[PDB]
Design a protein around this ligand. Structure first.
Ligand SMILES: [W+6]
Ligand SMILES: [W+6]
Length: 232
């Protein structure tokens, strides 16, 4: 009965996209369960799983996910292809990034123009991607223009908006903020990001809801789940 609850840790950034509000109800109905979404920072989402306080972890942070699995905490990790990265900024695009042909070129235009840019500057898969793209541009971002916020995607979109800055954002969070909570527009866009979904290991935590976690993972990577994710 539901009241029977499965706990999933994720990031605040993934909650903002709104995917879970559409993806979870058919699973809840089919299994007579409630899926509690615990949206916290990336580090905390894994710490919750390391402590056995959730049954499933759903994050986009490849190195950290690998470690979680290597460390024995997570089992049966599956890729969940969803979402993509875009560069947003003021609608008058002073750096002229709309003329960029790749994301590395766009960022290098920013660094060269000295246009204000907000980094997530945290644990997140968005941060890792950003750093990978700076490295592919062969630039190491040092300036004043380069800001490291140490916050989630939502607060970074807000800070970019106040500062009339550019930022690298997942489209999902942007689409959810567009218009109401920013006036920034997509100036550069490109495939999908390999979220990882993982069950907390009941050999480490025998009270975790593993069988129900495994149903969730099967669901999300199954035809119904994929259709929702691709239609979203
Ligand atoms: W409730
Ligand atoms: W994230």
């Amino acid at each position: 009965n539901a009241e029977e609850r499965l706990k999933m840790s994720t990031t605040t950034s993934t909650q903002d996209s709104g995917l879970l509000k559409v993806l979870l109800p058919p699973f809840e109905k089919k299994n007579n369960v409630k899926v509690d979404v615990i949206a916290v920072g990336t580090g905390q989402a894994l710490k919750l799983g390391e402590a056995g306080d959730v049954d499933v972890v759903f994050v986009h942070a490849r190195k950290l996910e690998d470690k979680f699995v290597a460390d024995g905490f997570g089992v049966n990790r599956k890729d969940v292809m969803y979402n993509d990265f875009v560069i947003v900024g003021p609608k008058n695009d002073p750096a002229g990034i709309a003329k960029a042909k790749t994301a590395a070129e766009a960022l290098k235009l920013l660094a060269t123009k000295g246009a204000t840019f907000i980094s997530r500057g945290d644990k997140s898969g968005t941060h890792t991607k950003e750093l990978d793209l700076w490295k592919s541009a062969g630039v190491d971002p040092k300036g004043n223009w380069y800001v490291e916020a140490g916050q989630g995607m939502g607060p970074v979109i807000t800070m970019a908006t106040e500062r009339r800055a550019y930022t690298l954002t997942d489209r999902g969070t942007y689409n959810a903020f567009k218009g109401a909570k920013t006036d920034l527009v997509i100036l550069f866009q490109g495939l999908f990001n390999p979220y990882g979904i993982m069950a907390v290991n009941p050999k480490k935590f025998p009270h975790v809801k593993y069988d129900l976690a495994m149903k969730l993972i099967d669901y999300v990577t199954g035809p119904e789940g994929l259709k929702i994710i691709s239609d979203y």
